[PDB]
């Protein structure tokens, strides 16, 4: 089984949401060694034994309910998103422990521009900072992260920090994260159709030998496999333009828990649900 | 509202499951009315009087569980699909009673070629028959029925029974069933893109002017509105590649009931659930 073994009782925990930004624990040194073990949850729960063959290769997660988490408390929408950064990194430490290879996170879509300039301006600058703050934590843990999304109208500063983050981690392989910012499904499929029309213009491609693979090879990030499990948080039941191509044959699981009330044990609950189930016909 | 007021006491009931193929009720005249009103259910039950503003103008359905039903009672899979035929027509009648105008249907799938050559060689002949038999019923109900699928492998004979039923109901417009046979969410994108490529290579379209609108236009039927309500039965929480592009922001409602037990009242259940939900499209 691929799960790391339950952290020693005395290993640092995460998150300590008394401070903010939550402080990521100084972890023990390695012998060494290479990738550090991720701190254990504050509850010290341990990953569930699941064969590598019953696991989702690729968990896509639609974070949901930060704005609404704040609002039931008399707070500004945007403060909930701040309790979200800790849950992100938590779930990340959970997937590593669990033995998960690909994790997609829907930070911001091509449709979140509809919201107020006050919230759009907060999210843009909070993704920028988050990235810079976490690049070295994520790096050390075995994570390979990079920006997945569309370029039109996206704060340049977000594209930069993540290409810094891509350069540091383009050789890590404990797990891969696709940090989706200004991501739209149709927009990404649109981006590739001209990746294609462009080659056809360079007569470097036959328009009658075009396959689903041909399209899949011209998406922004072409090594992103199909999405096995589609977590969507806070009771909402929709994909919302997330991994449209990739998540076609995805199995859906909708948790009713607001994202900031979320933690890695929740990720493990769902994944178990997925693995323990009898794979039906045609079902991978 | 826009639903049809209740059908009188002694109105024709559907279905009468005392035979196979089940027989369709001799429907009252209505001169000088236009189309013939949809028969009421066998329970003579009432349609929900939902607001027009909480109606799913476009409801797509992945009719699942047809062969499990049969398996349960020591039957071969063929006999399950047979009883699900009268389910469709009955489900088409309730959509009209409820005032829905766009109904999609996953009759067959590109995925469906990996089923036994026996079961598949049967699923091609049954659909052809159903169009040939039921298309006159639908003609009178105001149903505009057409084909939506890839051609390769698809029996010519199926396509042409829908090219005939389409040509007969082209000016009808109480509802519009898109009968999907050999449908592939990606397969339809792929094909919209083969078109784009050709035009681009013929010198009639410049790669840098391709937008989402352009893909939306090069689809097989580019008039299909986005999908509002995405139903699937059996207990399967998957889009499984249905209306992939259309259903980007659709509301997934899932149920356990297998298709051959499914009847209109259950379709009305679904739309009340979609009715209570808040759709936001990237809005706060």
UniProtKB/Swiss-Prot annotation, chains A, B:
Q: What is its EC number?
A: 2.5.1.86, 2.5.1.87
Cofactors named for this entry: Mg(2+); Mn(2+)
A GO CC term attached to the entry: cytosol
Check the record and name the Gene3D superfamilies matching this protein.
Decaprenyl diphosphate synthase-like
Residue numbers binding substrate:
64-69, 77, 81, 109-113, 115, 156, 232, 238-240, 280-282
Q: Which domain of life does the UniProt lineage start with?
A: Bacteria
Q: Residues that bind Mg(2+), according to the entry?
A: 64, 251
Q: What is its main location?
A: membrane
Question: Where found in the cell?
Answer: Cell membrane
Instruction: Cite the active-site annotation.
Output: 64, 112 (proton acceptor)
How is its cofactor bound, per UniProt? Binds 2 magnesium ions per subunit. Can also use manganese as divalent cation, however calcium and zinc ions are much less effective.
Q: How does it assemble?
A: Homodimer.
Q: Which family does it belong to?
A: Belongs to the UPP synthase family.
Protein's UniProt name: Decaprenyl diphosphate synthase
| Native organism taxonomy | Bacteria, Bacillati, Actinomycetota, Actinomycetes, Mycobacteriales
């Amino acid at each position: 089984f691929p799960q790391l073994p339950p952290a020693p009782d005395d290993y640092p925990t995460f998150p300590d949401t008394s401070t903010w930004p939550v402080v990521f624990p100084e972890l023990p040194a390695a012998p060494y060694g290479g990738p550090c073990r991720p701190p254990q949850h504050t509850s010290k729960a341990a990953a569930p034994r699941i064969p590598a063959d019953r696991l989702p290769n690729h968990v896509a997660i639609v974070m949901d309910g930060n704005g609404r988490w704040a609002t039931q408390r008399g707070l500004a929408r945007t403060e909930g998103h701040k309790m979200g950064e800790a849950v992100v990194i938590d779930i990340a430490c959970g997937a590593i422990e669990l033995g998960i290879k690909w994790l997609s996170l829907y930070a911001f879509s091509t449709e979140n521009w509809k919201r107020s300039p006050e919230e759009v301006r907060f999210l843009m600058g909070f993704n920028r900072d988050v990235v810079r703050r976490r690049r070295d934590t994520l790096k050390k843990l075995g994570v390979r992260i990079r920006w997945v999304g569309s370029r039109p109208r996206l704060w340049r500063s977000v594209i930069n920090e993540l290409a810094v983050a891509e350069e540091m981690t383009k050789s890590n392989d404990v797990i891969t994260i696709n940090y989706c910012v200004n991501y739209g499904g149709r927009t990404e499929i649109t981006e590739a159709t001209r990746e294609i029309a462009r080659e056809v213009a360079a007569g470097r491609l036959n328009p009658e030998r075009i396959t689903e693979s041909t399209i899949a090879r011209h998406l922004q990030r072409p090594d992103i496999p199909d999405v096995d499990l589609f977590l969507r948080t806070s009771g909402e039941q929709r994909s919302s333009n997330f991994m449209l191509w990739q998540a076609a044959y995805a199995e859906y699981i909708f948790q009713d828990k607001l994202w900031p009330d979320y933690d890695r044990r929740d990720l493990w609950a769902a994944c178990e649900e997925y693995a323990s189930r009898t794979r039906r016909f045609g079902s991978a």
